């Protein structure tokens, strides 16, 4: 129908600042600083007061209107990351061969080394992305914690750590081995 005006609304909390010049967003908060390059959407941002941003599309179709809410969700995830953080927890299970997972520094680059997955002689190497921190949670057996400000980087690093050790040419109703995400939450889990 080509609606005349469509708007979404972003509520920004107290201790954080946002700076948007030409569809390039910078969020500065109590945990760091995140940035994003939104120069493929054709939207307009407007500051109402110092606590509300409003994003709008004028004379947009259906495919164009469907991107306002994804812009709002991306900027809200930036705000949520810089004020709470993202914490993913991964648990790894085995039947016979215990998996040894360690953090290494191969020419100063912070890899995860996985070895003895299903008795393999192969060493699997997965690089830590920039900004995500990996810890090994004591008092829980066979668990890893990934923490960061960027939900995209934290989730992508947990995803390729999941995908590096998959079962090949076997029966997956019988061979229950590998690493799985068990919880996605926040570093500051409340308040």
């Amino acid at each position: 129908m080509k609606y005349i005006q469509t708007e979404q609304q972003i509520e920004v909390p107290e201790g954080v600042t946002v700076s948007i010049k030409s569809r390039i967003v910078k969020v500065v908060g109590p945990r760091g600083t995140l940035t994003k390059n939104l120069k493929h959407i054709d939207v307009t941002f407007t500051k109402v007061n110092n606590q509300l941003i409003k994003v709008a599309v004028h004379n947009g179709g259906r495919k164009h209107v469907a991107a306002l809410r994804t812009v709002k969700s991306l900027v809200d995830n930036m705000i949520t990351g810089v004020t709470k953080g993202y914490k993913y927890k991964m648990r790894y299970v085995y039947a016979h061969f215990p998996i040894n997972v360690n953090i290494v520094e191969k020419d100063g680059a912070k890899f995860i080394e996985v070895r003895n997955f299903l008795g393999d002689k192969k060493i699997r190497n997965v690089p830590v992305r920039d900004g995500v921190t990996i810890e090994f949670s004591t008092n829980v057996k066979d668990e890893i914690v990934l923490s960061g400000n960027s939900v995209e980087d934290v989730s992508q690093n947990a995803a390729d750590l999941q995908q590096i050790c998959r079962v090949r040419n076997k029966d997956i109703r019988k061979f229950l081995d590998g690493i799985y995400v068990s919880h996605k939450g926040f570093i500051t889990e409340d308040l």
Binding site: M1, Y3, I4, Q5, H58, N59
Partner: protein, 171 residues
């Protein structure tokens, strides 16, 4: 074309045992009087047993708009022939004149349903007097209090085949 509106009043031929036959009037949207009288005889032959050589045209007049500068909302009832069958439709057009609304409807039917002039009947044109009697959302979204919108990405045509600075689409 650019249409006009005519009233056409016709009649049978007076004869023995039928003196003073009944007069019938129609409102035809057409671009000239020849097409106006042809459309009159088309509709009268479909509705009665009268031919063009059985009857005669009594009067042909052109109707102008009463208030040509006043933006009105029109509801138009039409029927048309598609490739499979024939259907009735209701549409809404916001414009200043009945002939203007009829022109926009003919363009809209050609653009949206590939219906030519020869397969469209205008059943009725009427003005919707009150708001909250407007069914179409594409018309309703212009009846809002204090309506404002911009025009982003202004494109200007030029001459001279060459420019000496990069253009700017600001507005």
């Amino acid at each position: 074309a650019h249409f006009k509106e005519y009233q056409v009043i016709g009649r049978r031929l007076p004869t023995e045992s039928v003196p003073e036959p009944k007069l019938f009037r129609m409102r035809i949207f057409a671009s000239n009087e020849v097409i106006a009288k042809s459309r009159y005889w088309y509709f009268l032959q479909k509705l009665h047993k009268v031919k063009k050589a059985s009857g005669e045209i009594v009067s042909i007049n052109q109707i102008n708009e009463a208030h040509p500068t006043k933006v009105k909302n029109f509801g138009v009832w039409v029927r048309y022939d598609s490739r499979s069958g024939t259907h009735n439709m209701y549409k809404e057009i916001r414009d200043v004149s009945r002939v203007a609304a009829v022109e926009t409807l003919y363009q809209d039917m050609a653009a949206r349903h590939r219906a030519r002039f020869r397969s469209i009947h205008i059943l009725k044109v009427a003005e919707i007097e009150k708001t909250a009697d407007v069914k179409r959302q594409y018309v309703k979204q212009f009846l809002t209090k204090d309506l404002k919108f911009p025009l982003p990405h202004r494109v200007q045509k030029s001459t001279k085949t060459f420019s000496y600075k990069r253009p700017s689409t600001f507005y």
